[PDB]
Structure formats: C-alpha cells, structure tokens
Design an enzyme around this catalytic site. Structure first.
Site, PDB file in Angstrom:
ATOM      1  N   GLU A  53      -6.633 -43.691  32.001  1.00  0.00           N
ATOM      2  CA  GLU A  53      -6.625 -42.918  30.734  1.00  0.00           C
ATOM      3  C   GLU A  53      -6.860 -41.441  31.039  1.00  0.00           C
ATOM      4  O   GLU A  53      -7.288 -41.068  32.144  1.00  0.00           O
ATOM      5  CB  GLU A  53      -7.685 -43.446  29.755  1.00  0.00           C
ATOM      6  CG  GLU A  53      -7.811 -44.964  29.739  1.00  0.00           C
ATOM      7  CD  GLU A  53      -8.597 -45.509  28.562  1.00  0.00           C
ATOM      8  OE1 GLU A  53      -9.711 -45.034  28.330  1.00  0.00           O
ATOM      9  OE2 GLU A  53      -8.103 -46.439  27.904  1.00  0.00           O
ATOM     10  N   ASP A  93     -14.066 -38.349  23.000  1.00  0.00           N
ATOM     11  CA  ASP A  93     -13.157 -37.626  23.924  1.00  0.00           C
ATOM     12  C   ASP A  93     -13.096 -36.162  23.506  1.00  0.00           C
ATOM     13  O   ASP A  93     -12.798 -35.880  22.334  1.00  0.00           O
ATOM     14  CB  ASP A  93     -11.740 -38.177  23.867  1.00  0.00           C
ATOM     15  CG  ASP A  93     -11.551 -39.601  24.337  1.00  0.00           C
ATOM     16  OD1 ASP A  93     -12.504 -40.217  24.807  1.00  0.00           O
ATOM     17  OD2 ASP A  93     -10.401 -40.061  24.214  1.00  0.00           O
TER      18      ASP A  93
HETATM   19  O1  LIG Z   1     -10.547 -43.292  21.625  1.00  0.00           O
HETATM   20  C1  LIG Z   1      -9.228 -43.828  21.475  1.00  0.00           C
HETATM   21  C2  LIG Z   1      -8.637 -44.325  22.792  1.00  0.00           C
HETATM   22  O2  LIG Z   1      -8.377 -43.195  23.665  1.00  0.00           O
HETATM   23  C3  LIG Z   1      -9.274 -43.270  24.772  1.00  0.00           C
HETATM   24  O3  LIG Z   1     -10.521 -42.716  24.349  1.00  0.00           O
HETATM   25  C4  LIG Z   1      -8.780 -42.509  25.990  1.00  0.00           C
HETATM   26  O4  LIG Z   1      -7.487 -43.008  26.318  1.00  0.00           O
HETATM   27  C5  LIG Z   1      -9.441 -44.762  24.997  1.00  0.00           C
HETATM   28  O5  LIG Z   1     -10.559 -45.124  25.806  1.00  0.00           O
HETATM   29  C6  LIG Z   1      -9.572 -45.247  23.567  1.00  0.00           C
HETATM   30  O6  LIG Z   1      -9.130 -46.592  23.421  1.00  0.00           O
END
Ligand SMILES: OC[C@H]1O[C@](O)(CO)[C@@H](O)[C@@H]1O
Ligand SMILES: OC[C@@]1(O)OC[C@@H](O)[C@@H](O)[C@@H]1O
Ligand SMILES: OC[C@@]1(O)OC[C@@H](O)[C@@H](O)[C@@H]1O
Ligand SMILES: [Mg+2]
Ligand SMILES: [Mg+2]
Length: 477
Positions: free
Chosen positions: A333, A69
């Site tokens: 998310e 991310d």
């Molecule tokens: O990477 C940690 C968490 O945060 C995310 O990347 C975005 O919400 C999820 O997909 C993952 O479970």
C-alpha cells in the site's frame, strides 16, 4: 534458514515488460532474522528494524477528528513545501461522534487539511504537534460525481498525494471509492476504486490557511484486469494510493506509482517458481503446488506504474507493474519512489495479517532499492524487504487491533501508514496501543538509509520518538 533470492538492482526502460518479485525466499528472511523474545520482552524483530514503543498517553491530533493516512503539501520531487510561512498536511478523516465505530470509519473517509506555522522545532510546539484543522478539503458531493448513476450506499475519499503546481496551485491525486453494501458489510456489487485528480487553490493570511476550488474531479485510472485486478476478478481487490513524481532519468515524463493486485480471477492457481524464488537445485526449496494448496494464491500484491500521456497530466495510461508479491502478501500500500544518492528506493506499507501461509512479518514499511523506477529491486535488510516494523512476536499469533491476543505485543498495531520524508524522517498514525484506539498521528521517527540496509536512529528525539505528527517543510513554495 532459506537462501534469499538474489537481485541485481538493474534498471529497465519504464515502458518495458519487467516486474520485480518480492519472493517467498526473500520474505522468509524476516522470520529467519527474528529471535524468540526473552520474556517479558515481546519483540522478535531485529532492534534496527523495530519502531520504538509509543506511549499509551499519546494526544489526539484533534478531539473532533479521527486522522489516519496523512501526506504533506509536496512537489513532484518529493520536497515538502511551506506556503506563506505555513506547513500543510492532508489526511483521511472521520467523525468520532457520528454513530459509527473506529473500525467502520473507512467508508466515511473525507480528505481534510491541517496547518501550523512553519519553522518551530517539534519540542517547542504543543505536544499534539499544533495542527489546526481546516475542515474538509473537497466540497460535499464533488468526489462522488466520478461514479455517475451506479447503485451505491457509501462513497469515500482515500489516499494519494498533494502537488503544488488556472488560478489553481494544488493538484490533489487521490482514490475515489464507491461501495454498495448490505447493513452487515457484504458487497452487493464489488467496490469501485478510481484514481482521480481535483485541482484547487491554497490561500493564506497571518491568521489561517484555506482552500478554494476542487469542484471538478477527473477520473484518471481504473483497473483493466490485464495488469491490475478488477472488482469483477476479485471483490476484495485493492487499487489506490497514487504517488505522482518526476524521475530525473526521464525528464519530460510524469509518473505515478500506486497499489494494485495482480490481474487474476480470484482463486486462480497462478503463482510460479519465480514467485517462490528458490534455485531449482536448492534441496530446501518449497514446492509450488504445496504453496498454492496452502492458500497462498489469495495473496497477490503489486505496485503499479502509470505515465501521463498529455502535458496537462489529465490523461494517464498503465505500464506493467514494478513489483509483485504473489504468494507472499496481498497488500503493498501507499507506494512511493524515494530518491537518494542516485538510487531509487521503493517504500510500501504492508500488514502481518495479509501474509500468505508459510511467510510472516510485522505491520510496517517495506523497502527495495534499484537503479531506476523499473528495476530488479533489491529488498532491503538482508534481502528481506523489511524497513521498519511495529514491535511484534512472530512466534505467537497476530491477533487484531480490535482484539489483541494477550500472548502478542500490545504495540504490534501501534502505527500504520509510514510515509518516508526527506532526510529519512517517517510519519505515521496510531491504530491500537493496548485497549486504546488512536486515529491520531504517531511520533515521527528517523531511519538512516545506507545502500541495501536501514537503521532506526534511537538517538532521534526522545530515545527514537520525535514529535507527534512532525511533518515538516524543507522548502518554501
Ligand atoms: O484507509 C483506507 C484504505 O487505504 C489504506 O489506508 C492504504 O492503502 C488501507 O490500509 C485502507 O484499507
Ligand atoms: O536484460 C535486461 C536488460 O539488461 O536488457 C537490456 C536493456 O533493455 C536493459 O534495460 C535491461 O535491464
Ligand atoms: O505470479 C506470476 C507472475 O507472472 O504474475 C505476473 C507478475 O506479477 C509477475 O511478477 C509474477 O511472477
Ligand atoms: Mg500469518
Ligand atoms: Mg504468553
């Protein structure tokens, strides 16, 4: 072929009790719009909603770092800012040479920063995007202080956003997470997730970018089980990913959207006819009790809204959720509010494997449009909600990025964490392409956002694929 639930897009007071639903009748449009792939093609999605195939020979962003991310140095208007002629990004990071495997990295996540000279076209940079790894953003042990003396085996720094704004000029909004797990990965106590802020100072010279500060981490929000699900309600709850922004309709306020879950005890039979989204006289409506019996009650996504309650933005309070996906998907998310032509786009990422029984769609980015931050949001692309998916055969099993089904497209998990940047450019990270795992930035792609619909621009870059990790600044800080 189900009748999609209509939506007005009408705005509400941000403080009012109204939550838009992404209904089963809306989400079922994704499979309705899909086609059985013509072998040996393995993509069922409409071409305009499909991310191009990423090459298997992609570069790592850095050989010493798993990156996933990622967010730019930004302001509360969503502008991406350069500092003293440098572009800056922030990523969740882990160590590929630390003993744990890629799929177990999440509890080890640290926020890191990368930088590169501004103003170089993607195709004139190194193929890896030319990001220089600065190291961890936060001092060791600074984030974990938000938890105090609770039993714990691991803590992680999860996603949010960076705001250029004391000698401090950068506010990092992120998710502090604490885990108390047996060696098999089972929760001894439920995970703790706290949306937090740490302030620091970006500095630069001609050689490098560096940061000072981030010593003091401020807990802002933890779920209270009224609007947002707690670990006591559901050990598998999601609560993370603050996107802090200014709404031109409400000057003087600062808002935040984030990922939550609907605040129910796990296994409650809490879905309603409004979550299903059929006309009561629709002869093809689904039956509410049949849908809940199928297990759809375990899919309870929401997008939360919060507002700052002091000038310093160190105190926040929850408002009612702006979007729910009850009995549709458990995950919405990294939500973001993207302003275009006086409209409000809500973009959020979701997974194929977290759809409820009887609904299906790809990993990728989902989108909704309305007239305000709290709207009767219109799902994009034929009232479906899909903006851009990895190439996927919705007529064959999903598999997993660690065990690809050979009846499925080997790029169904090629990218994740699509973040929409100014001008409709979309950055993401690579998860799995056949047997190769990424932890590297994907090629940047471009979506043309036109009212209630979007089109992937297949003329952008090389047949739709721009530079690896092209996350450019549009304005100098
Ligand atoms: O990477 C940690 C968490 O945060 C995310 O990347 C975005 O919400 C999820 O997909 C993952 O479970
Ligand atoms: O019916 C809902 C609505 O039209 O009621 C009047 C105002 O409260 C508006 O914000 C709201 O959208
Ligand atoms: O699942 C039922 C419901 O009432 O739960 C609370 C909110 O998520 C609403 O949008 C939703 O319709
Ligand atoms: Mg499924
Ligand atoms: Mg086959």
């Amino acid at each position: 072929y189900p009748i999609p639930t209509p939506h007005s897009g009408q705005a509400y007071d941000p403080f009012a009790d109204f939550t838009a639903k992404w209904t089963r009748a809306n989400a079922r449009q994704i499979k309705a719009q899909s086609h059985v792939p013509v072998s040996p093609d393995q993509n069922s999605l409409p071409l305009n909603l499909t991310m191009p195939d990423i090459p298997a020979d992609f570069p790592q962003t850095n050989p010493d770092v798993w990156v996933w991310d990622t967010w730019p140095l930004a302001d509360v208007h969503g502008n991406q800012l350069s500092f003293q002629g440098w572009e800056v990004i922030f990523s969740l990071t882990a160590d590929p040479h630390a003993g744990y495997v890629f799929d177990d990295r999440h509890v080890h996540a640290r926020i890191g920063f990368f930088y590169r000279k501004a103003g170089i076209p993607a195709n004139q940079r190194p193929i890896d995007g030319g990001w220089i790894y600065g190291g961890h953003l936060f001092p060791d042990g600074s984030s974990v202080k938000v938890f105090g003396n609770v039993p714990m085996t691991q803590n992680a720094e999860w996603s949010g956003g960076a705001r250029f704004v004391k000698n401090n000029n950068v506010s990092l909004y992120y998710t502090a997470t604490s885990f108390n797990r047996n060696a098999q990965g089972g929760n001894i106590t439920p995970p703790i997730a706290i949306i937090s802020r740490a302030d620091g100072q970006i500095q630069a010279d001609d050689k490098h970018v560096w940061f000072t500060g981030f010593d003091q981490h401020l807990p802002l929000l933890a779920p209270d089980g009224k609007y947002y699900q707690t670990g006591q309600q559901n050990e598998f709850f999601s609560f993370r990913d603050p996107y802090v922004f200014l709404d031109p309709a409400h000057p003087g306020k600062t808002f935040m959207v984030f990922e939550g879950n609907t605040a129910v005890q796990r296994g409650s039979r809490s879905c309603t006819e409004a979550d299903l989204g059929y006309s009561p006289n629709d002869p093809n409506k689904e039956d509410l009790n049949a849908v809940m019996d199928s297990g759809a009650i375990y899919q309870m996504a929401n997008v939360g809204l919060a507002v700052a309650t002091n000038d310093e933005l160190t105190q926040w309070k929850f408002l009612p959720p702006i979007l729910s996906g009850n009995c549709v998907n458990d995950q919405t998310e990294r939500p973001q509010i993207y302003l275009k032509d006086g409209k409000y786009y809500l973009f959020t990422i979701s997974r194929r494997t977290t759809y409820a029984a009887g609904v299906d769609g790809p990993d990728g980015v989902y989108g909704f449009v309305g007239d305000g931050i709290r709207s009767d949001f219109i799902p994009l692309n034929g009232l479906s909600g899909l903006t851009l998916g990895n190439p996927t055969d919705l007529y064959q099993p999903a598999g997993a990025p660690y065990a690809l089904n050979p009846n499925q497209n080997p790029r169904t998990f090629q990218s994740y964490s699509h973040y929409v940047m100014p001008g409709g450019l979309v950055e993401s990270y690579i998860d799995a392409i056949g047997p190769r795992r990424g932890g590297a930035l994907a090629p940047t792609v471009k979506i043309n956002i036109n009212g209630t619909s979007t089109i992937l621009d297949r003329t952008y870059g090389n047949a739709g694929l721009g530079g690896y990790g092209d996350i450019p600044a549009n304005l100098p800080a």
